[PDB]
Curated annotation (Swiss-Prot):
Binds constitutively to TP53BP1. Binds CDC27, which is itself a component of the anaphase promoting complex (APC). Binds PIAS1. May be required for DNA interstrand cross-link repair. Also required for checkpoint mediated cell cycle arrest in early prophase in response to mitotic spindle poisons. Possesses beta-lactamase activity, catalyzing the hydrolysis of penicillin G and nitrocefin. Exhibits no activity towards other beta-lactam antibiotic classes including cephalosporins (cefotaxime) and carbapenems (imipenem). Expressed in brain, heart, kidney, liver, pancreas, placenta and skeletal muscle. Changing residue 295 to A: Impaired nuclear focus formation, reduced interaction with PIAS and increased sensitivity to cisplatin. The gene is DCLRE1A. The chain holds residues 700 to 1040 of 1040 of the full protein. Transmembrane segments: none annotated. This is DNA cross-link repair 1A protein. It is found in: Nucleus. Belongs to the DNA repair metallo-beta-lactamase (DRMBL) family. Induction: During mitosis. The mRNA encoding this protein contains an internal ribosome entry site (IRES) in its 5'-UTR. This 5'-UTR generally suppresses translation while specifically promoting expression during mitosis, when cap-dependent translation may be impaired.
Length: 341
């Protein structure tokens, strides 16, 4: 049974609600992004209307085989009428194709559902500038002040400088980057660009990247592993055993691996600055955990909410424990008292 924080009142609509069977009263199912916790339940046998971005619709058709007649892509930043209700899709600054959804209810209420997002001051100059929001359905993944991490730009600067140094010292080093979902593609694209290489990967991952509308992608990636000195591997293989096993397969081309594991937040962010980050090393293998986040930091979240001044907030993450719920409610009241809304 579908929980309340996935239903949009006063509509026939649900958000990221595909794992509950046929939801009573649902005339259109929205999908904010192509991450498995959110699409859980979709397949080629789904027969209700799915509303989403163009890039999410390419993934639904090619990766999950949803039939074309049930896929309804909408452009971004454009007022659209769905089943008699005005909606707008906005870029979420999460993974490729990820959106927030603005719903303009028949009774005059305006609802924003953030999906998963990384808040940014640029969102203060989207179509959000123009009107009031009554209810905010908020991605609260990192809603606590202990959750600090650098800008994506600082993280990428570290990765490129680290990879370029290593390979210039040793032209026989291979660089490996872990992946398990879409998102964070700048990690492996920026490293391959500084090294003058395409990124090599499995047929299954190449297919996924081909659905993402990235400019000049055919110039940036390949399935010919022999031609590339940046390889992608499943995140589960990014360990000393997996990396040893990969280096064996490379036919004596390489004598060293430098690997990256993009994570979200980890508790080493409480102590160590990005610039001071060091790897774990065994022999000719070194692994860097880098804190590349596609969710808001606490401070980014706080800024966005204090600017938007919503009348009510409904969290969509960390909702399963009383302690998490109580913590989040306390921060929402602080933010409201501090800003005066
Ligand atoms: Ni996500």
């Amino acid at each position: 049974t579908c929980p309340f924080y996935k239903k949009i009142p006063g509509t026939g609509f649900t958000v990221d609600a595909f794992q509950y069977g046929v939801v009573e009263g649902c005339t259109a199912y929205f999908l904010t992004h192509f991450h498995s916790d959110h699409y859980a339940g979709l397949s080629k046998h789904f027969t209700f209307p799915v509303y989403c971005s163009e890039i999410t619709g390419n993934l639904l058709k090619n990766k999950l085989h949803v039939q074309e007649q049930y896929i309804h892509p909408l452009p971004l930043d454009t007022e659209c009428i769905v089943n008699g209700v005005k909606v707008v899709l906005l870029d979420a600054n999460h993974c490729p194709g990820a959106v927030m959804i603005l719903f303009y209810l028949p009774n005059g209420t305006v609802i924003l559902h953030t999906g998963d997002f990384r808040a940014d001051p640029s969102m203060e100059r989207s179509l959000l500038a123009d009107q009031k929001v009554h209810m905010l359905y908020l991605d609260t993944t990192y809603c606590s002040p202990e959750y600090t991490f650098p800008s994506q730009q600082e993280v990428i600067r570290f990765a490129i400088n680290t990879a370029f140094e290593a390979v210039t010292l040793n032209p026989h080093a291979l660089v490996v980057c872990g992946t398990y979902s879409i998102g964070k593609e700048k990690v492996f694209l920026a490293i391959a660009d500084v090294l003058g290489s395409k990124v090599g990967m499995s047929q299954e991952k190449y297919k996924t990247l081909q659905c993402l509308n990235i400019p000049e992608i055919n110039s940036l990636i390949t399935t010919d592993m022999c031609s590339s000195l940046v390889h992608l591997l499943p995140m589960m293989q990014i360990n000393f055993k997996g990396l040893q096993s990969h280096l064996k397969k490379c036919g004596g081309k390489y004598n060293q691996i430098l690997a990256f594991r993009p994570t979200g937040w980890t508790h080493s962010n409480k102590f160590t600055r990005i610039a001071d980050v060091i790897p774990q090393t065994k022999g000719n293998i070194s692994i860097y955990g880098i804190p590349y986040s596609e969710h808001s930091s606490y401070l980014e979240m706080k800024r966005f909410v204090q600017w938007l001044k919503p009348q009510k907030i409904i969290p969509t993450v960390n909702v399963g424990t009383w302690k998490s719920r109580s913590t989040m409610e306390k921060y929402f009241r602080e933010w409201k008292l501090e800003a005066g809304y």
